Design a protein around this ligand. Structure first.
Ligand SMILES: Nc1ccncc1N
Length: 165
């Protein structure tokens, strides 16, 4: 009944930075929310722990969740390699929105991005499924390590993750 909360503990070249928590909108996109939750706890035997934010563009987004190829070309969901666009109820309204990365229609896996700006042009193309709850300051600190082409100046990892409550 209550939307679940998940956390990432972020590190910068192995050094602790801080914690980002997220509300996942299971009320509106239950299948997509449950994939991110499960990958956060690692309860299926695979997931986000130890992975990196491989593409950070200041004034755009922070993208991560490729735990199979580590560079934007991999990932897999708890449902199989790919799963369908669940719905497009929610929009890309501004910083802190959590949304699925993809490579065409119905190609969701494990990759996701945290917006750091409104990204309206993505509405009806990428599934929105959550938002940052606490630690937007930490997301802003992450964003300082990115670049225009998305290469990070230090390695940004999820040192730990899981579910709160
Ligand atoms: N397989 C993928 C490739 C690029 N972006 C997202 C996904 N899911």
């Amino acid at each position: 009944m209550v939307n679940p909360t998940v956390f990432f503990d972020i590190a910068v070249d192995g050094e602790p930075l801080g914690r980002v928590s997220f509300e996942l909108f299971a009320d509106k996109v239950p299948k997509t929310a449950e994939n991110f939750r499960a990958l956060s706890t690692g309860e299926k035997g695979f997931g986000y722990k130890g992975s990196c934010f491989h593409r950070i563009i200041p004034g755009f987004m922070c993208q991560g969740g490729d735990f199979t190829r580590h560079n934007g070309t991999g990932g897999k969901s708890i449902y199989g390699e790919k799963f369908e666009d669940e719905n497009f109820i929610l929009k890309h309204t501004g910083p802190g929105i959590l949304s699925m990365a993809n490579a065409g229609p119905n190609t969701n896996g494990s990759q996701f991005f945290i917006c750091t700006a409104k990204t309206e042009w993505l509405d009806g193309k990428h599934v929105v499924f959550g938002k940052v709850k606490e630690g937007m300051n930490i997301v802003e600190a992450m964003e300082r390590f990115g670049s225009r082409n998305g290469k990070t100046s230090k390695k940004i990892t999820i040192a730990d993750c899981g579910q709160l409550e």
